[PDB]
Amino acid sequence: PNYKLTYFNMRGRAEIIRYIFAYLDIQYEDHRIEQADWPEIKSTLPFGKIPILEVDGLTLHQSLAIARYLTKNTDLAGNTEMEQCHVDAIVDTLDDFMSCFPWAEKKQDVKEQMFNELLTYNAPHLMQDLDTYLGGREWLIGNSVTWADFYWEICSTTLLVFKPDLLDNHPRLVTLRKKVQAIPAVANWIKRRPQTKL
């Protein structure tokens, strides 16, 4: 296929797609726009949002819908229909929390206050639920890595920028991050990708 991913120059909501392409060793065009390109770009998005992925001339949208598309019938999918449901559910639990953050808030004081409140009063309950769910298992779902593990690593990377102590009570969740980071194709992408805050 010919693949063209359009997003900002940020990890953000495109990074899960970028991990998948790295892991599966699939070539793609990583098209990164500047704010100044936005109005022109937006005018041809189906729902006014990025990322989009063009696949042989047809446009897909929604980062997690695209991630699911790319991982079907690969080793990154759940190994059974039930596990596939659990992959989807963990991803949506993570994504729900990430969606609470006011990423585009222009009032910096207002934005910071909310970030800090979410990270102090809400994040610990999620981190605890994730730790309890993971227990002593190697990966979140099944006996091998899935794209839910990738999404945990991407989301927690973002959150650690703003709350360095996020995982001080959850060494098992740190171990999982490090395991994802050590997968050779992922490690290589992490080393070479453009360095951005988010």
State the catalytic residues: 7, 13, 103
Is residue 77 helix, strand or coil? coil
Query: Considering the rule CB under 6 A, would residue 12 count as an interface residue with ligand GSH?
Result: yes
Residues counted in the chain: 198
The DSSP element (H or E) to which 58 belongs, if any, is strand 58-61
Task: Identify residues 127-166 at the interface with ligand UX4 (CB under 6 A).
Answer: 154-155, 158
Q: Which phi and psi angles does 48 have, rounded to 5°? A: 65, 20
Query: Considering the rule CB under 6 A, would residue 92 count as an interface residue with ligand GSH?
Result: yes
Which amino acid makes up residue 5? L
Query: Considering the rule CB under 6 A, would residue 174 count as an interface residue with ligand UX4?
Result: no
- Decide which of ligand GSH, ligand UX4, Mg ion, none touches 50; Cβ closer than 5 to 8 Å per partner kind: ligand GSH
Residue 75 CA to chain centroid, in angstroms? Answer: 18
In the complex, the smallest distance separating the C-beta of residue 136 from ligand GSH, rounded to whole angstroms, is 27
Two tokens, residue 136: 């002593």
Query: Considering the rule CB under 6 A, would residue 48 count as an interface residue with ligand GSH?
Result: yes
- In the complex with ligand GSH, which residue's Cβ is closer, 63 or 146? 63
- Decide which of Mg ion, ligand UX4, its own copies, none touches 187; Cβ closer than 5 to 8 Å per partner kind: none
Question: Which is nearest to 2 in space by CA: 31, 28, 22, 23?
Answer: 28
Query: Considering the rule CB under 6 A, would residue 198 count as an interface residue with ligand UX4?
Result: yes
Between CA 159 and CA 142 the distance in angstroms is 25
Query: Considering the rule CB under 6 A, would residue 67 count as an interface residue with ligand GSH?
Result: no
The crossing angle, in degrees rounded to 10, of helices 171-182 and 184-192 is 90
The DSSP element (H or E) to which 171 belongs, if any, is helix 171-182
- Decide which of ligand GSH, Mg ion, its own copies, none touches 121; Cβ closer than 5 to 8 Å per partner kind: none
Two tokens, residue 76: 């990154």
Interface residue list for ligand UX4 (CB under 6 A)? 10, 12-13, 35, 38, 98, 103-104, 154-155, 158, 198
Q: Pick out the residues of the known binding site.
A: 7, 13, 38, 48-50, 62-63
Interface residue list for ligand GSH (CB under 6 A)? 12-13, 42, 48-51, 62-64, 92, 96
